[PDB]
Amino acid sequence: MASRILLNNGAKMPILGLGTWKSPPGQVTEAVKVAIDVGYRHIDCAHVYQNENEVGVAIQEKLREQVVKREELFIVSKLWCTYHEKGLVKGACQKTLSDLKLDYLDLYLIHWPTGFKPGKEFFPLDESGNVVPSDTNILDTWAAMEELVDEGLVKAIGISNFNHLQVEMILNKPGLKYKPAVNQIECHPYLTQEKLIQYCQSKGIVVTAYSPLGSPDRPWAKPEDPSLLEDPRIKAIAAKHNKTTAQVLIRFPMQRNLVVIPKSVTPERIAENFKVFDFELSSQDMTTLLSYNRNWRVCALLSCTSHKDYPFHEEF
Ligand SMILES: NC(=O)c1ccc[n+]([C@@H]2O[C@H](COP(=O)([O-])OP(=O)(O)OC[C@H]3O[C@@H](n4cnc5c(N)ncnc54)[C@H](OP(=O)(O)O)[C@@H]3O)[C@@H](O)[C@H]2O)c1
Ligand SMILES: Cc1cccc(Nc2cc(Cl)nc(SCC(=O)O)n2)c1C
């Protein structure tokens, strides 16, 4: 198991990163500091997570402490849906760089393929509870992302929550300057993403698996929902390998040549989640975990099911 994966831009992306969605501002600074101390070299961030300033504080402390150099870190952020308009992309990227206190990002992603009306609200809703779209399309937003690479503000650009047709739209864009390096998608034993992973890997696009533990802190969770961390079948695989259920869940995507970004703000769990390079799931273990697929999404963006670019009507 190599600890990094080569991207189509020539850079090496660490296969394990720390997620930061739902990491409250007063906890995330310590979380990122613990993560860097433990050995994480990749942090997944987003403007919409509303904590980039605090992530910035942590990165800067560790750089000043000389625990790491900037070139050893791989920092990802994401363009939020209200900034798809071509003329807003650069400003959004610059606000993120300013919050993170960085001169460049390693990877900047279009967070979702759906553009939302610009303004103060992250999720601008109509009276029916559906998001108000922006008059934007994916290809113009991609061209604005490419300008960030030309200016040196970001080393690589990519996408998140794009279906294969939407990726194909970018790959076939007239005058394409840069291919996406990464597609960041939800992926875990209940949503195994076989077809989309096959597709992406066949195009040289690295896949990053989000919500690998099933996002037990997601705010919309319901008691009837499935729970990976409580699944007795996965606990039995963990018990066999003298590991925790979370560690099994993190190792799983690693053996599929995916990047994985488990989130925690608990120092003991940050450390636990990093101890996944000292064991191997068997061929049978992988086949078994893949069989748990149930097409179940944490993140189904249900307020956008009428949006022209909603990604999840397509099979993959
Ligand atoms: N591109 C996108 O649209 C998108 C969407 C979703 C997620 N993401 C990214 O992917 C990351 C991970 O996904 P996620 O945040 O949804 O969920 P996750 O990483 O699947 O689960 C995080 C939850 O699991 C808990 N946890 C972590 N390690 C654990 C352990 N070893 N034992 C027991 N519980 C543990 C965390 O608790 P504590 O924090 O309290 O320890 C938190 O409640 C996000 O933070 C974000 O960076 C991206
Ligand atoms: C309180 C509130 C109001 C409106 C919408 C949402 N849904 C969110 C919020 C955030 Cl920060 N992230 C997601 S999905 C995670 C992602 O897109 O990375 N969904 C939430 C959590």
- Which residue ranges make up each domain of the chain? 1-316
Distance between CA 71 and CA 155 in Å, rounded? Answer: 11
Distance between CA 66 and CA 61 in Å, rounded? Answer: 9
| Centre of ligand 2 from the C-alpha of residue 277, in Å | 31
* 157-160 vs 182-186, strand pairing mode: parallel
Which of 130, 299, 302, 303 has most ligand 2 atoms within 8 Å of CB, for mutation? 299
Distance between CA 248 and CA 293 in Å, rounded? Answer: 16
Among candidates 61, 12, 15, which has minimal Cα distance to 209? Answer: 15
Q: Please return the burial class of 241, using the count of CB atoms within 10 Å of its CB with bins 0-12, 13-18 and 19+.
A: middle
Q: Please return the burial class of 128, using the count of CB atoms within 10 Å of its CB with bins 0-12, 13-18 and 19+.
A: exposed
Among candidates 133, 189, 141, which has minimal Cα distance to 162? Answer: 141
Q: Please return the burial class of 200, using the count of CB atoms within 10 Å of its CB with bins 0-12, 13-18 and 19+.
A: buried
Q: Which atom of ligand 1 lies at the shortest distance from residue 262's CA?
A: 19
Q: Which atom of ligand 2 lies at the shortest distance from residue 161's CA?
A: 17
| Centre of ligand 2 from the C-alpha of residue 49, in Å | 8
Phi and psi angles of residue 116, each rounded to the nearest 5 degrees, phi first: -115, 155
Q: Is 49 an active-site residue? A: yes
Q: Which atom of ligand 2 lies at the shortest distance from residue 219's CA?
A: 21
Contact between 259 and 182 under an 8 Å Cβ cutoff? The reply is: yes
Q: Which residues of 156-174 are buried (b: 16+ CB within 10 A; e: fewer)?
A: bbbbbbbbbebbebbeebe
Q: Give the residue numbers of the binding site.
A: 10-19, 111, 211-273
- Report how this structure was experimentally obtained: X-ray
Q: Which residues contact 150 (CB under 8 A, 6 or more apart)?
A: 177
Q: Which residues contact 282 (CB under 8 A, 6 or more apart)?
A: none
Number of CB atoms found within 10 A of residue 253's CB: 27
Catalytic position from the list 40, 49, 83, 292: 49
Q: Which two tokens stand for residue 185?
A: 């998608």
Number of CB atoms found within 10 A of residue 64's CB: 8
Among candidates 55, 111, 121, which has minimal Cα distance to 311? Answer: 111
Which of 208, 264, 275, 276 has most ligand 1 atoms within 8 Å of CB, for mutation? 264
Ligand 2 first shell, C-beta below 6 A: 21, 46, 48-49, 111, 123, 219, 299
CA atoms within 13 A on the CB side of 46: 24
Distance between CA 84 and CA 81 in Å, rounded? Answer: 6
Q: What is the resolution of this structure in A?
A: 1.6
Distance between CA 4 and CA 15 in Å, rounded? Answer: 5
Q: Which two tokens stand for residue 122?
A: 């992250």
The residues facing 110 across adjacent strands are: 79, 159
- Nearest CA, atom 37, ligand 1: 264
Q: What is the 3-state secondary structure of the chain? A: CCCEEECCCCCEEECECEECCCCCHHHHHHHHHHHHHHCCCEEECCHHHCCHHHHHHHHHHHHHCCCCCHHHCEEEEEECHHHCCHHHHHHHHHHHHHHHCCCCECEEEECCCCCECCCCCCCCECCCCCECECCCCHHHHHHHHHHHHHCCCECCEEEECCCHHHHHHHHCCCCCCCCCCEEEEECECCECCHHHHHHHHHCCCEEEEECCCCCCCCCCCCCCCCCHHHCHHHHHHHHHCCCCHHHHHHHHHHCCCCEECCECCCHHHHHHHHCCCCCCCCHHHHHHHHCCCCCCCCCCCHHHCCCCCCCCCCCC
Contact between 20 and 78 under an 8 Å Cβ cutoff? The reply is: no
Which of 80, 82, 122, 312 has most ligand 2 atoms within 8 Å of CB, for mutation? 122
Q: Which CATH class is domain 1-316?
A: alpha beta
